[PDB]
Scaffold this active site. Sequence first.
Site, PDB file in Angstrom:
ATOM      1  N   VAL A   1      54.148 -39.660  31.651  1.00  0.00           N
ATOM      2  CA  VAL A   1      54.220 -38.821  32.877  1.00  0.00           C
ATOM      3  C   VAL A   1      55.259 -37.723  32.687  1.00  0.00           C
ATOM      4  O   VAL A   1      55.458 -36.946  33.606  1.00  0.00           O
ATOM      5  CB  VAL A   1      54.495 -39.697  34.104  1.00  0.00           C
ATOM      6  CG1 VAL A   1      53.353 -40.653  34.338  1.00  0.00           C
ATOM      7  CG2 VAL A   1      55.822 -40.442  33.991  1.00  0.00           C
TER       8      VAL A   1
ATOM      9  N   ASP B   1      74.117 -32.800  37.350  1.00  0.00           N
ATOM     10  CA  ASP B   1      72.858 -32.098  37.004  1.00  0.00           C
ATOM     11  C   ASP B   1      71.837 -32.251  38.131  1.00  0.00           C
ATOM     12  O   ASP B   1      70.674 -32.566  37.897  1.00  0.00           O
ATOM     13  CB  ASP B   1      72.361 -32.529  35.629  1.00  0.00           C
ATOM     14  CG  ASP B   1      71.300 -31.586  35.073  1.00  0.00           C
ATOM     15  OD1 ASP B   1      71.177 -30.429  35.541  1.00  0.00           O
ATOM     16  OD2 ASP B   1      70.594 -32.031  34.167  1.00  0.00           O
TER      17      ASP B   1
HETATM   18  C1  LIG Z   1      64.227 -37.409  36.471  1.00  0.00           C
HETATM   19  O1  LIG Z   1      64.551 -38.630  35.778  1.00  0.00           O
HETATM   20  C2  LIG Z   1      63.711 -39.727  35.695  1.00  0.00           C
HETATM   21  C3  LIG Z   1      62.510 -39.905  36.388  1.00  0.00           C
HETATM   22  C4  LIG Z   1      61.749 -41.073  36.239  1.00  0.00           C
HETATM   23  C5  LIG Z   1      60.455 -41.216  36.997  1.00  0.00           C
HETATM   24  C6  LIG Z   1      60.381 -42.261  37.904  1.00  0.00           C
HETATM   25  N1  LIG Z   1      59.271 -42.463  38.626  1.00  0.00           N
HETATM   26  C7  LIG Z   1      58.213 -41.655  38.458  1.00  0.00           C
HETATM   27  C8  LIG Z   1      58.190 -40.593  37.553  1.00  0.00           C
HETATM   28  C9  LIG Z   1      56.895 -39.794  37.540  1.00  0.00           C
HETATM   29  C10 LIG Z   1      55.671 -40.466  37.695  1.00  0.00           C
HETATM   30  C11 LIG Z   1      54.454 -39.753  37.737  1.00  0.00           C
HETATM   31  C12 LIG Z   1      54.467 -38.365  37.608  1.00  0.00           C
HETATM   32  C13 LIG Z   1      53.203 -37.553  37.663  1.00  0.00           C
HETATM   33  C14 LIG Z   1      52.096 -38.103  36.761  1.00  0.00           C
HETATM   34  C15 LIG Z   1      50.768 -38.339  37.490  1.00  0.00           C
HETATM   35  N2  LIG Z   1      50.401 -37.200  38.369  1.00  0.00           N
HETATM   36  C16 LIG Z   1      50.133 -35.967  37.596  1.00  0.00           C
HETATM   37  C17 LIG Z   1      51.402 -36.915  39.426  1.00  0.00           C
HETATM   38  C18 LIG Z   1      52.796 -37.492  39.147  1.00  0.00           C
HETATM   39  C19 LIG Z   1      55.680 -37.686  37.470  1.00  0.00           C
HETATM   40  C20 LIG Z   1      56.894 -38.402  37.446  1.00  0.00           C
HETATM   41  C21 LIG Z   1      59.346 -40.378  36.772  1.00  0.00           C
HETATM   42  C22 LIG Z   1      59.382 -39.268  35.746  1.00  0.00           C
HETATM   43  C23 LIG Z   1      62.195 -42.075  35.405  1.00  0.00           C
HETATM   44  C24 LIG Z   1      63.416 -41.904  34.695  1.00  0.00           C
HETATM   45  O2  LIG Z   1      63.917 -42.873  33.819  1.00  0.00           O
HETATM   46  C25 LIG Z   1      63.188 -44.071  33.532  1.00  0.00           C
HETATM   47  C26 LIG Z   1      64.125 -40.721  34.811  1.00  0.00           C
HETATM   48  O3  LIG Z   1      65.332 -40.483  34.172  1.00  0.00           O
HETATM   49  C27 LIG Z   1      66.448 -41.169  34.669  1.00  0.00           C
END
Ligand SMILES: COc1cc(-c2cncc(-c3ccc(C4CCN(C)CC4)cc3)c2C)cc(OC)c1OC
Length: 287
Positions: A14, A135
């Site tokens: 993702v 940040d």
């Molecule tokens: C900023 O930082 C961190 C973030 C996360 C994190 C936690 N939940 C969900 C996400 C995510 C899920 C799904 C999508 C998209 C893909 C599907 N569709 C196209 C819509 C949505 C985007 C983002 C993330 C990236 C985890 C982290 O660490 C394990 C992070 O770093 C600390």
Amino acid sequence: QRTVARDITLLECVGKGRYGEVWRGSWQGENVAVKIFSSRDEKSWFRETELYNTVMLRHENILGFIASDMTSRHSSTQLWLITHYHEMGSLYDYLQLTTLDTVSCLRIVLSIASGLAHLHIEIFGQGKPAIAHRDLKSKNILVKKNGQCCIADLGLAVMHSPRVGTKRYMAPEVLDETIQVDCFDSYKRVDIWAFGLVLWEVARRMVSNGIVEDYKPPFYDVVPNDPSFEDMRKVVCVDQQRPNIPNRWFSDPTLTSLAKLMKECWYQNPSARLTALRIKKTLTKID
Ligand SMILES: COc1cc(-c2cncc(-c3ccc(C4CCN(C)CC4)cc3)c2C)cc(OC)c1OC
Ligand SMILES: COc1cc(-c2cncc(-c3ccc(C4CCN(C)CC4)cc3)c2C)cc(OC)c1OC
Ligand SMILES: COc1cc(-c2cncc(-c3ccc(C4CCN(C)CC4)cc3)c2C)cc(OC)c1OC
């Protein structure tokens, strides 16, 4: 004695960047997010791990920690951070397509202020050191299913009892290198500047009188993509520019109050900026 199921199925990527990758994963049916660190960004894993080994933060507006994993490989070390998974993704992502009403806009910004005040405040006794994020930006905030957000990425966080911040969101004292680096309150005031930019990004997407602004990042009209440190310094420090408040906001009592709030996060003088606790109080009295 007992079975320790550590297998995490990485199901879909993702996120991919210079930081490494984030995956949706499954542990025991349960969705988790797995950040796999680049070699470039090992120190971010160590810093977030060191902080969580110091204080196990638990707050509805802080991305929930699950695990830090270091695994030995043939000729490298693999570093994973495992957290709660928020399927709606980042506030940055969310604002691109979605517009807001007054209730959702306030819920988003008050939830962010709540998470930030939680980081900032020292609690004595089940306590915590004061923490500055360093940040804060819309890509480091996740949207939860209940409409509240949570703050992510404590890889640059500082505690009080060569990664630097995203340049587009750096406060003037970071860009002109006058920040008092020995002073914890300095780092809180840098986060409040960044908070004010996030509040601008969100407020643009709140509809009033049938009008909304397109999603834009802070300073989109005055710096290039991937602005240099010099590009930012000239805008923020030398010319003392601030994000535009559109006329249409002054017809709407919510956006009028939010424009005042973001102004008080953007004072050139860091000590004039509002505290996170004062921002929360102000937001509870809007609408
Ligand atoms: C900023 O930082 C961190 C973030 C996360 C994190 C936690 N939940 C969900 C996400 C995510 C899920 C799904 C999508 C998209 C893909 C599907 N569709 C196209 C819509 C949505 C985007 C983002 C993330 C990236 C985890 C982290 O660490 C394990 C992070 O770093 C600390
Ligand atoms: C090592 O690594 C990973 C481990 C796990 C994991 C899997 N099953 C059970 C556990 C567990 C938790 C807590 C206790 C308590 C119970 C007894 N009490 C007196 C003290 C100890 C026992 C067992 C864990 C921690 C998950 C992982 O990922 C999701 C791991 O990898 C990061
Ligand atoms: C890391 O994360 C997750 C872990 C687990 C999990 C698995 N086995 C055992 C445990 C456990 C049992 C018991 C204690 C004790 C602590 C001392 N006290 C005297 C009584 C309680 C602690 C830990 C847990 C917490 C489940 C999870 O989700 C369902 C986790 O989240 C993904």
